[PDB]
A paper describes a structure:
[name] plays a central role in the molecular and cellular mechanisms of allergy, and is a validated therapeutic target in the development of new approaches to treat allergic diseases such as asthma. It exerts its effects through its two principal receptors, FcεRI on mast cells, basophils and antigen-presenting cells, and CD23/FcεRII on B cells. The Cε3 domain is thus the critical domain for receptor binding. A branched, bi- or tri-antennary, high-mannose type carbohydrate chain ((GlcNAc)n(Man)n) is N-linked to Asn394 in each Cε3 domain, as seen in previous crystal structures of [name]-Fc and Fcε3–4 at different resolutions, and with varying degrees of disorder.
Numbering used by the authors:
A (entry chain A): 336 to 424, 428 to 546
B (entry chain D): 336 to 366, 369 to 422, 428 to 544
C (entry chain C): 335 to 362, 369 to 421, 428 to 544
D (entry chain B): 336 to 363, 369 to 545
Amino acid sequence: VSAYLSRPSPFDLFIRKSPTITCLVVDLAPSKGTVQLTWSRASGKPVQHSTRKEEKQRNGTLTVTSTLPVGTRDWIEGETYQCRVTHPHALMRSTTKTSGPRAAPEVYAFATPEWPGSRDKRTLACLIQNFMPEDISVQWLHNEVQLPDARHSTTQPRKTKGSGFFVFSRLEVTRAEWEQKDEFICRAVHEAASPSQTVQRAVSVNPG
Amino acid sequence: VSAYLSRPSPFDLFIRKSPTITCLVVDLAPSTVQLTWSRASGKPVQHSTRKEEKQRNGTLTVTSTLPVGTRDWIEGETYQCRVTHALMRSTTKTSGPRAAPEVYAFATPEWPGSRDKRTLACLIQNFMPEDISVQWLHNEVQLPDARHSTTQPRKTKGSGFFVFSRLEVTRAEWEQKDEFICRAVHEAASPSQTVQRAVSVN
Amino acid sequence: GVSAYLSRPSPFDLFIRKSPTITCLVVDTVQLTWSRASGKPVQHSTRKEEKQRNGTLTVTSTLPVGTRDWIEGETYQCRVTALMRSTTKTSGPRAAPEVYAFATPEWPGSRDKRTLACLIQNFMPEDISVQWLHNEVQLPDARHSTTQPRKTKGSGFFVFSRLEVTRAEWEQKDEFICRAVHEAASPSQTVQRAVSVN
Amino acid sequence: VSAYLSRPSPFDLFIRKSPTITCLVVDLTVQLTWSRASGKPVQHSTRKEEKQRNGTLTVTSTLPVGTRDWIEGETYQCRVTHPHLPRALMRSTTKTSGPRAAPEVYAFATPEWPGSRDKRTLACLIQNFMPEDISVQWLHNEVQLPDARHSTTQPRKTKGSGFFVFSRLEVTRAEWEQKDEFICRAVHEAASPSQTVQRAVSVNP
Ligand SMILES: *[C@@H]1O[C@H](CO)[C@@H](O[C@@H]2O[C@H](CO)[C@@H](O[C@@H]3O[C@H](CO[C@H]4O[C@H](CO[C@H]5O[C@H](CO)[C@@H](O)[C@H](O)[C@@H]5O)[C@@H](O)[C@H](O[C@H]5O[C@H](CO)[C@@H](O)[C@H](O)[C@@H]5O)[C@@H]4O)[C@@H](O)[C@H](O[C@H]4O[C@H](CO)[C@@H](O)[C@H](O)[C@@H]4O)[C@@H]3O)[C@H](O)[C@H]2NC(C)=O)[C@H](O)[C@H]1NC(C)=O
Ligand SMILES: *[C@@H]1O[C@H](CO)[C@@H](O[C@@H]2O[C@H](CO)[C@@H](O[C@@H]3O[C@H](CO[C@H]4O[C@H](CO[C@H]5O[C@H](CO)[C@@H](O)[C@H](O)[C@@H]5O)[C@@H](O)[C@H](O[C@H]5O[C@H](CO)[C@@H](O)[C@H](O)[C@@H]5O)[C@@H]4O)[C@@H](O)[C@H](O[C@H]4O[C@H](CO)[C@@H](O)[C@H](O)[C@@H]4O)[C@@H]3O)[C@H](O)[C@H]2NC(C)=O)[C@H](O)[C@H]1NC(C)=O
Ligand SMILES: *[C@@H]1O[C@H](CO)[C@@H](O[C@@H]2O[C@H](CO)[C@@H](O[C@@H]3O[C@H](CO[C@H]4O[C@H](CO)[C@@H](O)[C@H](O)[C@@H]4O)[C@@H](O)[C@H](O)[C@@H]3O)[C@H](O)[C@H]2NC(C)=O)[C@H](O)[C@H]1NC(C)=O
């Protein structure tokens, strides 16, 4: 049995201004009975109502999730939020905003050339590197509209040669999409980015 | 304490081909509530997902969503949700006359004080049975569900049903492309179980 | 058990007829008693019992209230004989309703009937009365349906109203009126829109 | 106490033709014993145990395996026994089954970023291959660059049935000035005929 507590996504925190944190509890057996996830703030001040979700996995695991809305000013000013896991057959996790040097991300967008026999599709790629810390949100937009999250896949932050991190994002598109409008935007949201914590670059397929 | 059990979304059933059913329990006072799925035939059920939320008025709203087999549902299996704390709800595919929906899409003229926004309205009516999904598209791409609101199906004066859908749009959207689509997914719609109408702000 | 509900006056009764009433509805010798927060006396109320199809017993008490008393913010209470419900005018900001009326085009194979739709939106508070008129004669309530007020993306509310009309009606006069009654509507709490089938 | 058993790298298996596998024991006196599912003999293995700065001891054993033995489907077994553990840990490894598909390879060069006039980042997209095992080499001056010069992401599913990785390599001005050609080479069992697919890229046109 292991538990994890995440920080707010930069998109939710800075753009949407509705940050949430998630207590993710993975139960191995799972022992009979209901797990309890209890939220608190280090200050002892009130917390909002949380959402709870659980589902039995294919391999037999019970996965439990609790998502807590947090105040925007509360989080940025350094509040510590705590998740307590209770199971009869005690785990404590906490989260607060990281401290340390900040660095904005570099962003680059690319499009693959045509692969023989696959005329109706291309792969778009985005390199986002040299940012600090590793918390970052990546989105893809078409027609100034964000595409669904499941359309793309973004790698985990790996360390660069020095202090910074990098991620790669991949988005498969169709010929119908780029013929409707041949411009796609990779957008990164990061605490150290400027202005408005947003950095974005565009790419076009430029078909023959 | 009341319980509800919904049939699959026509969009999930006919387009996504991954239908689900949802058991919703609304409880006035908290005390855990168990929601057990079973089939009238006795055959196995898949793993369901469970959600809980304490609402602003202090109520434990509990939802459980169960994937069902596509053929199993169309062939007419009956599924039961049993609530232990005993409430029993069942659901199955409707049987009876079918009628395709009529779709009408409208745009409001400019109102004083709202220069940069219009409201689109969609009237879908005279369909049978009542199960229907309503979607809005722009640039032939579906908008997020939160952008619009849709009423629950209600009886017409005759034998069909009607729903209204509302979508607020911005000047930036209709300037980029002045065409919005109200699309309905319904089992009787032909072809492809879908019928749609376009509307422009002009 | 039982649920008890207490409603506010309809804007049509409050502003046009100037004869507002509030209704205490209890759903199953049940007793319903009225009182005011100020301690002033209440008027005589009307009690009504009806048997529902499912067998449940429905009891209502309808109390006339003063026009100035309600608008100035009096609180009225219905005590059920354990149960207590209160009602008062909703405070907060005001906004007048926008009214838009629409007519469906002729649908294939349905030449002798047509559907009118009225969208009323961005008003607050949510209390609103919706009427349909033909030749300045108010049509019976059962001819139309109106949704319950729901939040827009902003602060105001919206409702949809639906009226099926006949060929005989629009041949006699092809003009129908969607009328809304609302506290913030100016100057006499009424805004309306005309619509034609063709 | 957990145990992990790896497969050989495609580079070791197909280019160098000297494959090895590694049995890793974490959170642990531990004994690691190798055997083959066929019953045929194993070679000598090398052992290295290193105490970690979080209270954990790790033991690593690397076993050389036959090239044809592995390609023809031998199963290798690592069994962990220790007094503290009640039940012995058993792990096995064999080549991945299932359909095969060669990788597509694409190589890009970033434009200049402010404050980095003397360096560029190269990126290689390798996608739609299966199974997921893959190696990447970068070549300059007709020879291979050291492995620590680049980083490759973990294999991830495409929308279809294949996998993709990205490979990242930072190059210096002196390198592309000396010769402006860099080669991203993928090593994969489904790449025909020599288990390699490569693409060249230049910093400037
Ligand atoms: C304290 O606060 C809480 C929080 O607000 C509050 O909890 C609510 O309690 C009420 C109690 O009545 C709940 O209301 C009920 O909800 C039932 C579930 O509705 C869902 O399922 C509907 C069926 O879906 C099928 O059909 C559609 C259409 O064909 C299809 O698309 C679907 O895919 C599926 O096949 C569905 O229609 C409905 O959707 C409406 O709401 C969603 C909300 O997001 C919206 O997105 C939709 O556009 C649409 O507007 C929803 O998904 C519902 O079945 C039930 O309806 C009964 O009553 C009506 C009355 O007219 C009848 O017409 C109907 O036939 C049923 O008999 C009823 O509406 C409500 O769900 C709770 N809220 C939440 C969030 O759970 C407490 O009450 C509060 N406590 C107090 C006040 O004391
Ligand atoms: C205390 O500190 C110790 C460290 O001192 C720490 O120990 C770690 O424990 C975690 C527990 O999960 C270990 O993680 C597992 O590692 C498995 C081994 O695979 C890794 O190592 C491979 C061999 O590395 C050698 O070679 C490389 C260069 O070749 C060199 O840099 C190394 O130093 C070493 O010499 C390596 O090849 C492998 O990378 C390949 O594979 C991954 C995919 O797994 C791919 O993404 C890579 O691109 C590359 O192709 C990898 O780095 C690993 O198999 C295993 O992964 C499975 O399990 C996890 C969960 O269990 C799943 O998430 C995953 O998907 C797989 O199913 C897992 O990641 C870690 O290796 C230990 N590290 C060390 C140094 O021992 C403790 O955890 C700390 N805490 C405690 C309480 O003790
Ligand atoms: C049985 O199957 C289960 C489901 O497949 C397995 O559960 C998985 O267990 C792993 C590790 O035990 C979890 O991985 C962790 O993920 C969290 C969070 O990752 C997500 O959130 C971050 C930030 O919020 C986001 O950036 C990522 O993209 C993810 O969306 C990490 O913090 C951990 O370090 C770790 O990587 C899986 O999340 C978990 N899956 C589920 C569905 O719960 C289980 O391990 C299997 N068990 C056996 C015995 O086979």
